[PDB]
């Protein structure tokens, strides 16, 4: 839960460990809920798929997740995804029940400077005598 890498099977706990499969199922459900269409400006899936037929040289192992001698995943990617899930859970929980991109792209520094619109009053200094 806290993102610590799962070392070789330790003592752990007989009873709590039985809930690991349920916890994994909950994480998969949470990941599905979090997944949603992303704004095309920052979308990265399209960038890699913009050329579906490209079959260039495969990148070296430095650009791929670490793997063990047997070929199984090292396990570092699992904890990294946990960090993303935890952050997404926190941010999504904030938004409880209780053209936009266009404006952001425009460079504001070149726009007209903000001008104050404070009211002005000129009171008449003519009051009746006692």
């Amino acid at each position: 839960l806290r993102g610590e890498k799962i070392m070789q099977n330790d003592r752990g706990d007989v009873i709590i460990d039985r809930y690991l499969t349920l916890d994994q199922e909950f994480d998969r459900k949470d990941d599905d809920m979090l997944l949603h269409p992303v704004k095309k400006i920052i979308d990265l899936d399209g960038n890699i798929q913009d050329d579906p037929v490209v079959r260039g040289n495969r990148p070296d192992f430095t650009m791929q997740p670490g793997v063990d001698i047997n070929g199984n995943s090292d396990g570092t990617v699992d904890i990294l995804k946990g960090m993303n899930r935890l952050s997404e859970k926190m941010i999504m929980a904030l938004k409880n029940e209780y053209n936009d991109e266009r404006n952001e792209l425009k460079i504001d520094d070149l726009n007209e400077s903000y001008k104050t619109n404070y009211a002005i009053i000129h009171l008449k200094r003519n009051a009746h005598e006692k």
Partner: protein, 752 residues
């Protein structure tokens, strides 16, 4: 504001303009009038897309030539950003001009990003989308349905609707971004992909990625629609050479060859079955082959070749098919023994690198195959697949890779190297041999581009030295310069950290990655900058594997625990969609005041296109020089080829490659001139590479800040952030860092 150049007016969409933007526009106009290529380097902080778009559009809308514009970009995200700028520019022009001009603008992209069919669009693979989309629109299904309505073959209503309406009336006149284009198409029930592709001729400006102009697989069809005299613009071209090198490359594994035999066996079985029921289908195609007709003549416009031409169009032979592969069965035998030969070469127990000529000679000696039949392997296979009319091509997809290999290796002879290495992953119990057909010459793929288009504008925020690209990529430049940014106050504070708090040198060398001293110093550095950074902090690692090891070590050390107190931690992951969600969360945390830190790779996907401006980027931390894996056969072969041909030292190129990827990350912090951010280059080796940075970044770098420690950098950062938050006197930047209309006119008069 309407301001004039030597002989034309320009409608800038803002009341005031930067001094750099005016100079940038003037130089672009000079290049266009004189002609020829030019390499411009404008600062990333100053607006560049708006300035470039404004001038080029005015140039075509005023001069009699009415030349078209081709605007290339690294990724799709850049296309949308440029499209939004273009539409904003058009709106301003229409308002000032009163009447909306006869102007059209679209952007090419793959089927996946534009598909609207509920079933096909759900596919997770771009190629799978193409297979399904083609099946519903190849024209075979429509003809079969017309012949027999009882046929159950489906169609695509979006594609069919386009037939009713004319091509010139697919969309209303104007600029159509991806979001706007999708909305209109959904309402009208039309396919954006076909509308965009079919309207290339009508468009005045076309925006598409480099892969649509340098990759022959998806460039030969598009290149026929664009006009020869159009203006070509390369935006963010500092990484173009990688695209050129990666376009004519290919990798074959043991699994690929195994599936090739399965596909060939299936192909032979299908041919026999087709022969039994009716052999007239094959006879008609054979007669056409003898006549000399190629795929282009045989295949109709609606249909597409099964295997895209892997080699450049100019290198394709024009003579007739050799004859050894004319018959359906003879070609299958030709394909089969070629696959077996590749399987034999996979058994090598040591690395073997050889030229294509040697590979062909050995191939011929063992199994009798000549150069010429191989060159037609891709073309012949497409015809055979079309003749067989196979409904499903799931098995035959493997044969596509083999066909590509044959044409590539049988067409080019200089600048390509074939490397077979028994160990693809050295840390593997069982070898997994892989043979790589790598391209060493980056100028082969871009040679047609420069020969075709007279004027090319190569511009990028971080592109230096400007003299390397003309050497690495063979072309001549009429003009080339870099613009310094006239800024009232120091908007960015670059620093080169070389030591930790304990005065111990720190470096990201991959062989000492698991060093407690180096790991801890980076960990402490990340925490300290997270404490003083208000909203956004981006960390770029040299490689993904390095990022994983460091993060795992930090978790055990508990350094990440201290980070969690101040900022949410988002990490880039191999999955593309998950990374997009991470960026969404990272942006949200920065905007709402929670604060977040993004851990990503310098040479990853996030660095190419995603701009971390204003609150998003307030500090950028570069954890080491993003060097390439030195012990790589592909890199070593390219370096040797480059040294012998273009006379570039191996060390010089490696520093050039590393610095370009560090510079691009640094330049994503600034969007305008009011934006401020602190750039950190945390590595010992960065100290002596200051001169290799972009000129505008170097100017902001100071001698005192050339070799700093963590304590000094943090103290320096605290003062800088405090100062930059204070209001700036308008008189300071009234007419030096920003120009009004009066200031621009005064400057123009002074020049004359």
């Amino acid at each position: 504001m309407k301001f004039y150049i030597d002989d034309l007016p320009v409608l800038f969409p803002y009341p005031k303009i930067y001094p750099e933007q005016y100079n940038y526009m003037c130089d672009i106009k000079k290049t266009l009038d004189v002609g020829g290529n030019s390499i411009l380097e404008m600062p990333s902080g100053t607006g560049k897309t708006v300035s470039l778009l404004s001038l080029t559009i005015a140039y075509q809308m005023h001069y009699p030539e009415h030349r078209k514009i081709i605007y290339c970009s690294r990724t799709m995200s850049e296309i949308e950003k440029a499209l939004v700028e273009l539409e904003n520019l058009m709106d301003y022009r229409t308002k000032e001009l009163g009447y909306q001009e006869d102007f059209r603008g679209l952007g090419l992209t793959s089927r996946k990003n534009l598909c609207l069919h509920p079933e096909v669009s759900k596919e997770r693979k771009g190629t799978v989308v193409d297979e399904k989309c083609r099946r519903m629109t190849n024209g075979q299904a429509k003809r079969k349905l017309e012949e027999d309505p009882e046929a159950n073959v489906e169609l695509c209503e979006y594609h069919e609707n386009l037939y009713n309406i004319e091509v010139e009336d697919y969309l209303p006149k104007g600029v159509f971004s991806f979001e706007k284009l999708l909305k209109y198409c959904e309402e009208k029930t039309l396919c954006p992909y076909f509308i965009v592709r079919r309207m290339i001729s009508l468009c005045n400006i076309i925006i598409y990625s480099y892969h649509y102009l340098l990759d022959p697989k998806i460039a030969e069809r598009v290149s026929n629609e664009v006009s020869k005299d159009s203006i070509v613009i390369f935006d963010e071209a500092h990484n173009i050479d990688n695209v050129c090198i990666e376009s004519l490359s290919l990798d074959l594994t043991t699994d690929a060859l195994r599936r090739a035999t399965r596909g060939a066996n299936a192909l032979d079985e299908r041919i026999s079955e087709v022969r039994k029921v009716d052999s007239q289908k094959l006879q008609d195609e054979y007669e056409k082959l003898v006549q000399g007709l190629h795929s282009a003549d045989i295949l109709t416009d609606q249909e597409e070749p099964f295997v895209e031409t892997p080699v450049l169009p100019q290198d394709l032979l024009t003579e007739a098919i050799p004859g050894n592969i004319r018959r359906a069965e003879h070609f299958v035998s030709f394909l089969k023994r070629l696959i077996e030969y590749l399987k034999t070469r996979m058994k090598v127990l040591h690395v073997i690198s050889e030229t294509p000529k040697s590979f062909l000679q050995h191939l011929k000696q063992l199994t009798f195959i000549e150069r010429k039949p191989l060159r037609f392997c891709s073309e012949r296979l497409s015809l055979l697949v079309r003749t067989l009319e196979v409904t499903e091509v799931e098995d035959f997809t493997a044969l596509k890779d083999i066909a590509t290999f044959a044409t590539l290796i049988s067409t080019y002879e200089e600048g390509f190297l074939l490397i077979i290495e028994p160990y693809e992953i050295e840390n593997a119990a069982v070898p997994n041999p892989i043979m790589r057909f790598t391209c060493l010459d980056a100028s082969i793929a871009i040679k047609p581009v420069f020969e075709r288009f007279s004027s090319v504008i190569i511009t990028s925020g971080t592109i230096s030295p400007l003299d390397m690209y003309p050497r690495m990529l063979n072309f001549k430049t009429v003009l080339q310069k870099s613009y310094a940014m006239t800024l009232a106050k120091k908007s960015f504070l670059p620093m080169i950290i070389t030591k930790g708090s304990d005065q111990v040198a720190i470096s990201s060398r991959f062989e000492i990655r698991n060093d407690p001293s180096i790991v801890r110093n980076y960990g402490s550095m990340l925490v300290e900058f997270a404490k003083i950074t208000p909203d956004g902090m981006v960390v770029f690692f040299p490689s993904y594997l390095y990022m994983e090891s460091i993060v795992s070590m930090w978790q055990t050390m508990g350094i990440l625990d201290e980070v969690w107190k101040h900022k949410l931690i988002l990490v880039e992951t191999p999955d593309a969609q998950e990374t997009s969600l991470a960026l969404e969360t990272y942006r949200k945390a920065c905007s709402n005041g929670r604060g977040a830190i993004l851990l990503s790779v310098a040479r990853g996907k996030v660095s190419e296109g995603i701009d971390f401006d204003h609150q998003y980027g307030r500090t950028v931390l570069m954890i080491g020089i993003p060097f390439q894996y030195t012990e790589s056969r592909i890199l070593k072969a390219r370096l040797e080829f480059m040294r012998e041909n273009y006379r570039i030292r191996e060390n010089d190129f490696l520093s050039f490659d590393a610095m370009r990827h560090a510079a691009q990350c640094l330049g994503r912090v600034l969007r305008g001139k009011d934006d401020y951010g602190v750039m950190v280059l945390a590595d010992r080796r960065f100290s002596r590479k200051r001169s290799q940075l972009p000129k505008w970044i170097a100017q902001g770098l100071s001698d005192a800040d050339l070799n700093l420690s963590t304590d000094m950098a943090i103290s320096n950062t605290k003062q800088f952030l405090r100062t930059m938050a204070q209001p700036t006197d308008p008189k300071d930047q009234e007419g030096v860092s920003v120009w009004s209309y009066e200031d621009l006119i005064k400057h123009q008069n002074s020049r004359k």
